[PDB]
Amino acid sequence: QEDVLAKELEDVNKWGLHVFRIAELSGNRPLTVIMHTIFQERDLLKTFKIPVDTLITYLMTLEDHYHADVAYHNNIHAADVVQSTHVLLSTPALEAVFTDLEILAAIFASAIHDVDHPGVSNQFLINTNSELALMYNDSSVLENHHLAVGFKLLQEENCDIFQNLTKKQRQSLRKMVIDIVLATDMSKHMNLLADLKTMVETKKVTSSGVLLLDNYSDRIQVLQNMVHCADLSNPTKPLQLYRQWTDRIMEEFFRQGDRERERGMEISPMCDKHNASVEKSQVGFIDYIVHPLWETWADLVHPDAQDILDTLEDNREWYQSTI
Amino acid sequence: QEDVLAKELEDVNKWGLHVFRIAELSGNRPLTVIMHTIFQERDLLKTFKIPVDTLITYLMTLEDHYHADVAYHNNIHAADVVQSTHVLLSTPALEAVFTDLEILAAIFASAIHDVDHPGVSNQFLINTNSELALMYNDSSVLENHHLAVGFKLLQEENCDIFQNLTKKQRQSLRKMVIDIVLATDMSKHMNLLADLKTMVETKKVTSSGVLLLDNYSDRIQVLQNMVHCADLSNPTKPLQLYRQWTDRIMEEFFRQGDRERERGMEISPMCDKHNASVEKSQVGFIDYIVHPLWETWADLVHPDAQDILDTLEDNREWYQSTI
Numbered sequence: 001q002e003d004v005l006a007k008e009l010e011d012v013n014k015w016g017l018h019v020f021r022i023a024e025l026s027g028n029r030p031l032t033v034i035m036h037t038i039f040q041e042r043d044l045l046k047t048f049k050i051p052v053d054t055l056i057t058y059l060m061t062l063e064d065h066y067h068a069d070v071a072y073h074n075n076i077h078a079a080d081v082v083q084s085t086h087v088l089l090s091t092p093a094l095e096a097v098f099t100d101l102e103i104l105a106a107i108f109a110s111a112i113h114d115v116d117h118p119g120v121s122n123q124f125l126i127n128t129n130s131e132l133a134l135m136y137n138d139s140s141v142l143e144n145h146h147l148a149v150g151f152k153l154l155q156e157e158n159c160d161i162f163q164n165l166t167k168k169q170r171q172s173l174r175k176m177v178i179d180i181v182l183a184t185d186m187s188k189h190m191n192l193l194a195d196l197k198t199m200v201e202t203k204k205v206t207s208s209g210v211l212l213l214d215n216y217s218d219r220i221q222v223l224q225n226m227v228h229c230a231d232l233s234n235p236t237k238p239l240q241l242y243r244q245w246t247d248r249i250m251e252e253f254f255r256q257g258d259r260e261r262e263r264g265m266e267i268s269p270m271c272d273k274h275n276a277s278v279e280k281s282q283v284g285f286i287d288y289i290v291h292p293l294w295e296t297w298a299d300l301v302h303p304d305a306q307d308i309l310d311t312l313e314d315n316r317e318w319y320q321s322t323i
Numbered sequence: 324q325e326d327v328l329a330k331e332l333e334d335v336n337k338w339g340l341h342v343f344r345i346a347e348l349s350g351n352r353p354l355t356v357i358m359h360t361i362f363q364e365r366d367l368l369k370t371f372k373i374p375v376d377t378l379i380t381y382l383m384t385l386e387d388h389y390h391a392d393v394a395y396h397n398n399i400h401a402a403d404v405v406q407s408t409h410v411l412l413s414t415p416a417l418e419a420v421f422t423d424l425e426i427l428a429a430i431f432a433s434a435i436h437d438v439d440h441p442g443v444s445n446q447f448l449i450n451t452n453s454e455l456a457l458m459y460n461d462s463s464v465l466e467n468h469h470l471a472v473g474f475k476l477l478q479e480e481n482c483d484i485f486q487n488l489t490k491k492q493r494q495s496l497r498k499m500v501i502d503i504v505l506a507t508d509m510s511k512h513m514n515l516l517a518d519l520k521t522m523v524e525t526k527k528v529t530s531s532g533v534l535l536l537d538n539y540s541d542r543i544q545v546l547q548n549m550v551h552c553a554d555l556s557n558p559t560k561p562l563q564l565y566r567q568w569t570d571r572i573m574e575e576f577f578r579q580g581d582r583e584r585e586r587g588m589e590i591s592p593m594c595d596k597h598n599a600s601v602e603k604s605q606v607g608f609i610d611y612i613v614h615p616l617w618e619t620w621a622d623l624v625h626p627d628a629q630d631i632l633d634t635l636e637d638n639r640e641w642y643q644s645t646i
């Protein structure tokens with residue numbers, strides 16, 4: 001049974017990994033085994049002198065702090081965004097662009113980017129005068145919390161996976177990780193995409209055809225959009241994967257709408273299980289958000305992402321056909 | 324004692340109120356009595372149906388969360404910033420530009436803008452890997468905390484002074500208070516001043532000279548720079564007041580540098596009691612921060628800021644003469 005899991009983990013470099021199968025085969029540890037597999041694959045334990053027992057201890061604690069009873073924003077989502085970022089990092093247009101530390105920051109940020117998510121939106125937390133929104137002054141409420149939890153767990157017993165980085169390395173990693181996870185706030189998507197478009201239009205490549213990034217502002221912006229694309233990568237995945245992600249977000253949204261009903265609040269878009277249009281909402285989300293984003297990413301790394309974009313377009317056609 | 328306290332409060336509309344005297348005479352309650360008085364003077368208990376006992380209960384819980392053993396960032400500084408904002412909101416060049424809710428927000432924000440300050444800077448909190456910096460991801464660490472504490476105290480028994488505001492009024496006040504207090508972060512000073520300068524060069528006034536601000540974006544900017552001015556108003560007060568503020572901030576800075584020294588940390592500027600230049604620092608603070616700010620704000624409110632801007636130049640000349 002560990003033979004089969006090891007077999008499935010040979011796909012870790014491929015888009016459309018069977019992440020739900022890996023979650024089952026690993027005893028509901030997809031985030032630990034996928035992260036561990038990726039750190040080995042990239043030689044990160046050697047490079048940053050990470051004790052393997054420390055890595056496993058932190059990963060299992062981090063994975064524990066995802067809510068097993070949240071339908072979408074759980075440890076499987078975290079594992080999938082981690083793995084999708086890992087693939088995006090390997091794209092030919094980006095070869096040798098990012099340091100080992102920046103690669104570690106992007107992968108770590110993906111792993112923690114939704115930890116302790118309660119299954120309700122920032123807006124719900126603001127409108128219900130939650131303790132989280134009160135702590136964070138209504139501003140990137142969840143994303144600040146994911147960061148705070150993800151860093152705090154490094155301080156538990158035998159959990160500091162960055163114990164052997166230099167002070168300058170830790171300081172630089174911490175800042176990049178914060179910059180990246182804060183960029184997953186969906187209210188920042190339009191400004192983030194507007195900036196990605198500007199970069200594509202003024203794109204510079206090196207003598208080898210690889211993307212040329214002169215400065216932190218450009219490097220972090222690329223990693224911010226990279227993790228944001230991985231976060232919004234479900235509709236680009238093979239359809240059997242995508243449909244299960246849609247089932248899960250809809251279950252999670254419906255539970256929030258029930259709570260909104262239970263309080264006499266207006267029910268949020270897509271949260272009313274009595275007046276739902278699942279297919280129309282996926283087509284809408286692709287047309288106004290996901291495809292504009294992925295088409296701009298595809299341009300930045302052209303033609304590396306052509307197959308991903310073709311799948312997205314087919315999946316949109318399929319959902320559209322069911323209306 | 325009661326009778327002389329009331330006579331000092333009669334200067335509540337004057338730049339240079341004897342706030343240390345009021346602190347002495349009120350039993351270390353300057354925040355409460357100055358806030359209470361200003362609410363009367365502006366008719367805010369009537370306009371917003373604030374029960375007088377609720378006002379007092381909250382103001383006293385708030386004042387108790389300012390630290391008595393912090394030399395500068397305590398309840399006297401809070402009371403001083405409140406009263407200073409109260410004065411700047413009466414600048415004839417600002418014609419009741421601001422609604423009554425916009426006035427309530429700027430005064431409430433002033434009162435809470437430093438609550439629970441531990442007497443160390445944001446940078447110290449970041450460098451010591453403090454709980455506060457871990458909570459707030461190194462971004463406006465103290466200012467987020469002041470907001471969160473100031474708002475949370477409204478939930479104590481009989482402390483909700485906004486209980487009779489409408490739901491929309493509460494939502495608008497909360498956003499404005501957050502926007503103002505976040506702008507007291509000193510790392511945002513330069514951008515904030517840049518924006519005040521732009522507002523000055525494309526300023527628009529009546530023939531009577533009074534300022535015309537049409538969109539929320541510019542009106543919140545004025546209130547941000549206003550409370551910022553009130554926070555940085557010590558060098559514009561009568562010299563007997565300003566010198567006391569200088570003594571207190573240097574004591575607080577020196578205590579931070581003593582905590583930095585015994586920890587083995589690099590001692591922050593102006594925090595080394597064995598190598599300080601108190602008067603040079605004040606002159607440099609005026610030349611680079613306080614005068615540019617108040618010179619841009621005097622332009623904005625011409626001629627209303629001349630007496631203030633005059634005191635600042637007098638005080639800068641005096642400090643320079645002690646060198």
Ligand SMILES: COc1c(OCC2CC2)cc2oc3cc4c(c(OCc5ccncc5)c3c(=O)c2c1CC=C(C)C)C=CC(C)(C)O4
Nearest residue numbers: 184186187189231234235245246249280281284285288289
């Ligand atoms: C335009 O408003 C919409 C929207 O409009 C079209 C309306 C029908 C007319 C549809 C949406 O559909 C979704 C479908 C999803 C998922 C979603 O993502 C949640 C998310 C939250 C936080 N971080 C990361 C992700 C959403 C949306 O958020 C979402 C939003 C909000 C977006 C924005 C404010 C920028 C996630 C996974 C899958 C892909 C399985 O389904």
Ligand SMILES: COc1c(OCC2CC2)cc2oc3cc4c(c(OCc5ccncc5)c3c(=O)c2c1CC=C(C)C)C=CC(C)(C)O4
Nearest residue numbers: 507509512554557558568569572603604605607608611612
């Ligand atoms: C240029 O950097 C300087 C600086 O250099 C120029 C001089 C050559 C050395 C000198 C400074 O001297 C001060 C003297 C003070 C007070 C101060 O304000 C503390 C504060 C912290 C947090 N919130 C609000 C306020 C400061 C400074 O902050 C400060 C800064 C940092 C500011 C900025 C980066 C924008 C407060 C009260 C009084 C007026 C009594 O004295």
Ligand SMILES: [Mg+2]
Nearest residue numbers: 113114142184
């Ligand atoms: Mg998220």
Ligand SMILES: [Mg+2]
Nearest residue numbers: 436437465507
């Ligand atoms: Mg402050």
Ligand SMILES: [Zn+2]
Nearest residue numbers: 077113114231
């Ligand atoms: Zn996510």
Ligand SMILES: [Zn+2]
Nearest residue numbers: 400436437554
């Ligand atoms: Zn202050």
